[PDB]
Design a protein around this ligand. Sequence first.
Ligand SMILES: OC[C@H]1O[C@@H](O[C@H]2[C@@H](OC[C@H]3O[C@@H](O[C@H]4[C@H](O)[C@@H](O)[C@H](O)O[C@@H]4CO[C@H]4OC[C@@H](O)[C@H](O)[C@H]4O)[C@H](O)[C@@H](O)[C@@H]3O)OC[C@@H](O)[C@@H]2O)[C@H](O)[C@@H](O)[C@H]1O
Ligand code: CL
Length: 747
Amino acid sequence: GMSEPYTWKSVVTGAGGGFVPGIIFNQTEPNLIYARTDIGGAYRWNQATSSWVSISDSVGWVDWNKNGVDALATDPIDPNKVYMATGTYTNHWDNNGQIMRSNDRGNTWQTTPLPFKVGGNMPGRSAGERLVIDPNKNNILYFGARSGNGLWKSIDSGVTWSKVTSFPNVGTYIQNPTLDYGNDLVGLSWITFDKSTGTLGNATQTIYVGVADTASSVYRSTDGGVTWTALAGQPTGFLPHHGELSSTGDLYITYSNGVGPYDGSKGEVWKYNKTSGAWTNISPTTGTDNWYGFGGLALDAQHPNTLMVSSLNAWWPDEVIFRSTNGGATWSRIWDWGNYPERTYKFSMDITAAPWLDHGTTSTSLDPSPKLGWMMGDLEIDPFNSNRMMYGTGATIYGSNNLTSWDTGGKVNISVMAKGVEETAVLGLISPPTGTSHLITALGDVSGFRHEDLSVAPTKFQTSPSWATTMSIDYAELSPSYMVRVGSADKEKTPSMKSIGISNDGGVNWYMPNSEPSNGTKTTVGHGQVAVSASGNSILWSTSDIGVYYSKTSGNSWTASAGLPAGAKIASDRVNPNKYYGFYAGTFYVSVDGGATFTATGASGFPTNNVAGLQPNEAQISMKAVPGIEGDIWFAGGNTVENKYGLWHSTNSGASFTKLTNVEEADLIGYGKAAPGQTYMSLYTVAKIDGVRGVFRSDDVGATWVRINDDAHQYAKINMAITGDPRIYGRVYLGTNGRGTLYADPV
Ligand SMILES: OC[C@H]1O[C@@H](O[C@H]2[C@@H](OC[C@H]3O[C@@H](O[C@H]4[C@H](O)[C@@H](O)[C@H](O)O[C@@H]4CO[C@H]4OC[C@@H](O)[C@H](O)[C@H]4O)[C@H](O)[C@@H](O)[C@@H]3O)OC[C@@H](O)[C@@H]2O)[C@H](O)[C@@H](O)[C@H]1O
Ligand SMILES: [Cl-]
């Protein structure tokens, strides 16, 4: 069992590229800020460099669900302490969650398993915070759970947790009762202490709790959590996203008719006075002027009658931030209509940290580029600096350092504030053997990028075609400037858009071919996997819906392949352009006529990742032919159910494989430049070798393996993508599901 020290760095996107449902300011120590994501763990802010530091990269393979951070609380009495409620899904895709605790601001963690599931990537994840510390008695914490598990509490600083059985409402709202995703109760929505009802060293007596129940959503305890009642006279019909208590004694609540993050077509904002019990509707828009929920809610701690709310979601032409300086009596919009369709703006967008955020499109008043945002469920004002705002969108963290310019006739300068954040899901990677780019990525949501300087954010979004998610990308090994990517075009927005993109200049410029695979009745929606012949004279497209198709006309025409079942994984030989390989349900296939016909080989023992009790990200199939060697294929994948799991090698074009006996488990395989004095390329694998899960390199065709990551650089379920660099020995590129792309070299 060996290991080699490596330097692990992020491939920089500048924006992060993912959803940030929560930003949490410490109420005591200035500039102590945390950010939580739905699939990529959490971050802590570094004021000296205006950047975020991940406090989650020790999360590994088995405990991968810890990177779903449903809630986070930072301790106002001892700011060194921070807690997280983690777990990713509450349906059959995940196991139970946990509460994690740290005494060093997230540098190290201890964990307490929960007897139920946590939903860091489930609906309503931007509602919160659902984990809070008693600001007068910091050994006390409360957690508002999902799925009907109700209210839970700790009195030993989060080490043990007990159900608050006296809480009367576990939730009634269900987002998708007829789907397998989100068919459970959303549950509790947020918890808020009233610090004035305690003193330092004495438990806070008044606690407010929001619940996802349109008929009765806001609750209070006035005896320290023993007895609970619904607030009299509260509004009904909506779902409270946040509840924030001003020092003036007013509780402000944003409401949407959904829990988000994607919906919300009606909304309200209310304020409740804790002394009189009076409810006041302070919705910025009502009636037909309102077509969106209200999500983000930010109080100004230094000016307790100043607050802001964000739409969730207005969509067109953009979202809206509303600001009030008189407790919600009147609101000022961050933009207004001038002479239609011209608009006026109280803000300026700065995306110089991630220029690709313009999606390659010029901005107009009715179609801004970049937009102010979307999925704006969390809006924050720095409690120690009224001029600092931060908010999360579906793509990045935005912020300002001159917010009060709003009040004095100026413009709020909004800029990307996501430095150090990487949150994309990586669906594919290629390291081109030639040209200025060593890495082209296939990403969810933001398509992917052709990188040059891995420390500089890309300037160009992938267009013509333009889509959200690239599912696969490949290049012609013998003509690496020829390159093909497939995703899923939005043909309701652009009915002429295609789900396949082709490049002749190594991914600097793409174009869309004339046709797509079609079975006469229906044209493919896209996605699936693509493979490009060694010479670039043909393309193989294993579509997601209508099976395997090939093109010998660079996408001008597609013909269905025979003998290879729909859903098969595919790969091209890197030397013989006539040779394609396929795999489906334990059977390996080979084509020798450019992908027109496939025949099964006798390769035996391959896993049929068909088993019943497998979570969506638990198993994988990684199959790649070797550059420069015809018929040399490596194969990684499987699962422990079937006891078919590891790394195989064929040198006879897949007629038979040898399973490496020194590799207990393997999920991905990739190739990089040969070590000095070696002729065969180095192997890179995500695997379990000699009892250790991690990333391994072999310079001797798999005879011996060295671990090139470590326990501080694991990145949760890393079964997404891996490749070496054909020009740089020792270099590895590692995809993740929520931490973007990493690259690493020996120290
Ligand atoms: O019944 C299935 C149901 O799922 C619906 O999608 C929801 C579901 O998706 C699961 C996937 O979530 C990804 O993480 C998302 C994250 O939730 C989003 O907040 C953010 O915007 O994007 C990331 C990444 O997603 C992109 O990259 C990976 C690719 O698989 C995705 O298709 C792509 O969008 C995880 O990375 C995935 O591992 C996970 O499978 O749960 C989270 C919800 O946010 C989704 O909406 C789907 O809409 C529906 O049609 C149906 O399939
Ligand atoms: Cl797009």
